[PDB]
């Protein structure tokens, strides 16, 4: 087994209540079987896009998670990740 | 120089459950795509049929469409064969290809891994274990080589049919391949270290590093190439700095689709 | 049934040739062999074709395939009366021992022999033990006779039967008739159309 | 490269235990059992890859597998029904796509023993007048009285078995076709040239190989057990 590692970044340069695009990209698990979810203050987003699942030279899988969001003062956006490598699922916030 | 991979993907939980999935790159740009709940392989680029006439197509998706059944019951008979020396959960990746270099020059490979360890691969007319591999798998291996059918088709797969496909896709899809995406940048703190920001730039090579003006900062460090969906690329650099000195420390970007003029930010 | 065979069924005379058909949907078809059985025994293998389209023989056999088509035959040529038996195809899957071979349910052929030199006559026979009980056999006739069960239940009559003495390239029809008695010979074989040639010795 | 079945032909009951065997020497590691009946193509019952490995097949009901060593491949009925009378072969093969067949076992499942009954053998020697006409000689064998119908026919000339000059009903027949379990009669004819037939030194036997009950079968009637067994007729020439 593999630990995932998930990183949060944008498409844009982030600018309050200003429409943009979130990435959730979960790199270096194994097996394949994972579960991402893309949060807003807790709470699951719907319509979230998957890239295909993919691996790389080191056989290591990878898969690219986003959807739009808008960036305000208030709000904060997460992704939670559950993989059988993690006895709890991990999440890590989005910071500027 | 491009590669071109299709890498294959096959899960098994058990005597009966499985899927495989597989997706098809050149170079960093996808191509085609296979899930499993599908019957037929989507094309990702218009170009993705390459200089290949319908009727070749149709006839090597349906190669490939009967591979994915006979893969799936063989490994489960593989299984099967070897027990209880291997039990299910079971992963295997394949990865096929070839490396295209200038001219006529070409360079094919089909590597198999088995839960996540490379341990097979075609080479020459038959199947053959890496250094590494457990000697168990000298019994599929020779039973995979025990069927001459399946090794022709391999070879005429991997030394005629992929350089033959590839180079008529590099010829399809010359636009895309050579687009020129520029990149954004800002910048940001946290509680010091500086972020520069770098996102939406094709191709993947660029520059990025730290200045006070002439000055290369060293201690920026740049992390690794993060995808975005719309296939351009985001990365970032970070500088260590002590807190009350961000005074003149610019960001310096160069890159092919900017053509000479850098993007200079400053805090 | 991912294996079909025609006909079921076929009767063809000494000498003449017969083809027989396959056609399948097994996918993918590494290869296809053709088996010989005769009736009560195992299958001996006749040719195994494995090519897009291929051809093969093996004495009075060939065999074509064509794998686009899903198809084949068997051809035999100038037939035998040995060569009465069910013939049938197998599909294999694989190149390998991972494959699994699909069975058709075989086609059945009969050859009927020539009957060069017909002498029909049916003779009385004595039990080696007892000079009681007897048969009475009717042979030497050529295949267009027919051999019928008699009134009586209490007379036995069986089917006719051809014996090849190799050694001496002759083959002969017979057929056995006893019952438990006033039953005589001359008079056993009544419910049949037998030749009005048939020898009855006194 | 050859492959062993034992037994060639047993006839048992409802709710016994039947185990048929395979034996190969070829040092195979994958074995193969299937049943053929008419209007199918051989179908597959179970497996193996090798020692203690076993795998079903396409109708495993009913059958239980046992692959205790390289050699061996059994089948096993725990509780045999009617409807598994049926031929049933073995295969092996190593890892190529061939499968070397075994010369098949056929199997009877009745619902009851009570009718078992060996044959009555006699074997009627060649018509004088035959020999007059023809220069050849027929004897005829007549097996009677048995049940079921699972027997073996054969004609040994000096103890060693005779193939050319023989004929044998393809079927037997029903001694009295009205009754529930009828017994059967079958005929062969084995046919010679006159002086062979005429020479005193040449032993002529038939031999019906009947299959009935085992030793190890209940029998509870007053006549005798009608068990598995070879009864014959037997006569020399003459001239
Ligand atoms: C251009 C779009 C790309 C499409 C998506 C990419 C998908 C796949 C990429 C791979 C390309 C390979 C294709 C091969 C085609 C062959 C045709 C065929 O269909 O081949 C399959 C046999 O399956 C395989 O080939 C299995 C692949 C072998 C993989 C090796 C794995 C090593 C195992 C190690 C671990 C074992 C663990 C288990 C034990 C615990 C069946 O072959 C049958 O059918 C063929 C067509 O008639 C005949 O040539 C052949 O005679 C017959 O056997
Ligand atoms: C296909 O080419 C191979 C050699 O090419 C290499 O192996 C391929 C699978 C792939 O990895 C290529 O990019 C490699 O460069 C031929 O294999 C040789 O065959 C000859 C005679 O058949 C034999 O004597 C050699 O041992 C083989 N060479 C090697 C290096 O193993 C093969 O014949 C080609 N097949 C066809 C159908 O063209
Ligand atoms: C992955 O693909 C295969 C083929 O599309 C699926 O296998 C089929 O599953 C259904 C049951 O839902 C069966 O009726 C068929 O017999 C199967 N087809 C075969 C074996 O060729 C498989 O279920 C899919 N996997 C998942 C996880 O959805
Ligand atoms: C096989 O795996 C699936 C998914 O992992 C699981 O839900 C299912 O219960 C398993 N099948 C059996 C028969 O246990």
Known sequence: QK???????????????????????????????????????????????????????????????????????????????????????????WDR | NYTFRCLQMSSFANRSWSRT????????????????????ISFTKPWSQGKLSNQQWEKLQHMFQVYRVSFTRDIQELVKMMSPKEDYPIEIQLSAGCEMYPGNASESFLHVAFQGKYVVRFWGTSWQTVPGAPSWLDLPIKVLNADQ???????????????????????????????????VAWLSSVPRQLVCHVSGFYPKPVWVMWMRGDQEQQGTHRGDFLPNADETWYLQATLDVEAGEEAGLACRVKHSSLGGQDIILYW | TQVEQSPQSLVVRQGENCVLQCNYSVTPDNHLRWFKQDTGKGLVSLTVLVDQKDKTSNGRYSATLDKDAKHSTLHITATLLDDTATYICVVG???????????????????????????????????????????????????QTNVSQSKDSDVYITDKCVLDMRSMDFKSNSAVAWSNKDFACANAFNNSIIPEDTFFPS | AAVTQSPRNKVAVTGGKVTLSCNQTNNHNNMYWYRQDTGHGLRLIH????????????????????????????????????????????????????????????????????????????????????????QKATLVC????????????????????????????????????????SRYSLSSRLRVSATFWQNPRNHFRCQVQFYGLSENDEWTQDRAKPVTQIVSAEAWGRA
């Not at chain 2, 005629?160 to 399809?172: I, K, N, W, Y």
């Not at chain 4, 004929?167 to 037997?172: G, K, M, N, V, Y």
């Open chain 4, 47 to 134: 497996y193996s890859y090798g020692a203690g490995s076993t795998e079903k097949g396409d109708i495993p009901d009913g059958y239980k597998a046992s692959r205790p060593s390289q050699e061996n491949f059994s089948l096993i009925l725990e509780l045999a029904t009617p409807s598994q009378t049926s031929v049933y072969f073995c295969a092996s093969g190593d890892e190529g796509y061939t499968q070397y067949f075994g010369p098949g076992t056929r199997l009877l499942v009745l619902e009851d023993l009570r009718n078992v009954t060996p044959p009555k053998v006699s074997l009627f020697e060649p018509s004088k007048a035959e020999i007059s006409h023809t």
């Open chain 4, 142 to 181: 007549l097996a009677t009285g048995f049940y079921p119908d699972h027997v073996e026919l054969s004609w040994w000339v000096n103890g060693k078995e005779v193939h050319s000059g023989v004929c044998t009903d393809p079927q037997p027949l029903k001694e009295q076709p009205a009754l529930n379990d």
């Open chain 2, 21 to 40: 999935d597989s997706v098809v790159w050149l170079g960093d740009l996808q191509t085609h795509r296979w899930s499993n709940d599908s019957a037929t």
């Open chain 1, 3 to 93: 630990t995932p590692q998930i990183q949060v970044y944008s498409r844009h340069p982030p600018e309050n209540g200003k429409p943009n695009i979130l990435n959730c990209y979960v790199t270096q698990f194994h097996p394949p079987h994972i579960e991402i979810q893309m949060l807003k203050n807790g709470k699951k987003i719907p319509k979230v896009e998957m890239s295909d699942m993919s691996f790389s030279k080191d056989w290591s899988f990878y898969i690219l998670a986003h959807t739009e969001f808008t960036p305000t003062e208030t709000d904060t956006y997460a992704c939670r990740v559950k993989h059988a490598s993690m006895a709890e699922p991990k999440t890590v916030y």
């Open chain 2, 149 to 183: 059918g399946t090794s022709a088709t391999v070879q005429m797969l991997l030394n005629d049919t992929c350089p033959l496909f590839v180079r008529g896709l590099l010829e399809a899809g010359k636009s895309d391949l050579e687009k020129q995406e520029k990149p």
């Open chain 3, 93 to 143: 899957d694989r190149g390998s021992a991972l494959g699994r071979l699909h069975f058709g349910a075989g086609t059945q052929l009969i050859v009927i022999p020539d009957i060069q030199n017909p002498d029909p006559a049916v003779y009385q026979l004595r039990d080696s033990k007892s000079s009681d009980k007897s048969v009475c056999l009717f042979t030497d006739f050529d295949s």
